[PDB]
């Protein structure tokens with residue numbers, strides 16, 4: 001069975017036919033939830049905002065700049081804008097980044113950014129989008145595109161000396177919905193990389209325990225640098241986020 | 248000439264200027280991650296193989312980056328990236344941080360290809376794993392629909408890779424099987440004793 005030919009014949013994407021898309025991944029989930037800091041969040045216009053005000057340095061940064069390509073039929077950030085962010089100034093010497101890169105030029109420019117900020121890419125996580133509910137909805141293609149683009153990439157980068165697969169499969173969201181799958185947070189948190197976690201260009205809708213969310217559209221803020229730092233003061237400085245709290 | 252053709256050869260040393268120009272190039276290199284060093288990969292004379300068309304370049308690990316370097320050095324812009332989701336016969340899915348469910352194939356463009364059927368297929372392949380390092384045959388169908396009837400060349404292919412409209416190059420092919428008269432003529436002229444040395 002050639003699912004590529006089938007897509008040409010019927011409009012059903014090949015990923016529509018992936019099936020199912022010990023099992024002790026809990027308890028670890030439970031340790032993560034016990035370890036999580038309270039959710040913190042700050043409305044900030046990241047282009048005019050001195051990113052150095054966000055302290056302490058982070059163990060994990062999730063970066064979700066709003067690309068124009070996300071608004072097919074709908075303030076967008078160019079890769080020029082993104083590459084000029086000073087992400088290295090807020091990353092801990094040993095730390096990780098997850099950069100949503102889209103499906104076009106970001107797959108190259110996102111790699112330039114990682115290297116510019118001092119990371120090396122260690123994984124390429126693909127969000128595969130099914131179209132089970134709308135097989136008859138052709139895609140308006142990028143002028144440079146050779147194929148219909150049915151996925152987005154989230155690049156994982158590491159800097160310093162340091163159960164899941166590199167695929168997320170969900171149905172393609174409705175037009176004008178820019179949200180990324182919440183499964184990315186599960187993958188990130190299951191790595192047990194530390195507890196200072198930053199989500200840049202998050203929204204009210206993405207705020208999450210264990211995360212500091214910073215972005216221009218937040219309606220409310222509760223961020224206080226000294227309060228945030230107090231979550232990681234001794235004896236809690238080096239916790240992975242997957243272990244018991246210290247008595 | 249339509250039926251499969253191939254040349255057993257060391258791709259480092261073959262004079263590929265005898266092969267003519269191709270609408271599509273595909274390569275599945277033995278990245279140094281019988282491999283080629285990064286420099287040997289950079290020095291492959293890919294630029295002579297096409298004037299206007301597409302290149303399909305399989306990559307993994309740090310060749311996701313090295314392959315982008317080669318692509319650009321050879322004169323291509325990366326304009327797509329196919330991923331092959333690996334399944335078993337029951338359509339279930341089969342880098343030290345995550346398990347890997349996919350293989351990547353970069354898509355580069357050179358020049359301004361005219362008359363190709365862009366957007367017919369999508370950029371995800373769902374297909375069963377076969378032997379080690381055996382690429383899915385679906386890619387030939389996607390490529391044929393993109394550019395029907397044109398001449399194509401595959402680098403680092405194996406016997407099971409030979410296909411009509413394709414010339415296959417690799418060092419595990421059986422001999423030399425050439426049917427296109429223009430290629431045959433230029434091959435005899437360049438290699439009158441049939442040997443390919445240095």
Ligand SMILES: CC1(C)CCN(Cc2ccc(C(=O)NC[C@]3(O)CCCN(c4cc(NCc5cccc6nc[nH]c56)ncn4)C3)cc2)CC1
Nearest residue numbers: 256257258275276277281305380381382403404417418419
């Ligand atoms: C799963 C994927 C989609 C598919 C696989 N993919 C990785 C991959 C794995 C295997 C092969 C493969 O098996 N390919 C057939 C060769 O035959 C095997 C041997 C070298 N190879 C060459 C090499 C060469 N020059 C260099 C050289 C070096 C040392 C000694 C030599 N002696 C003669 N040449 C020598 N010239 C021509 N062909 C080609 C290809 C790709 C990942 C994704």
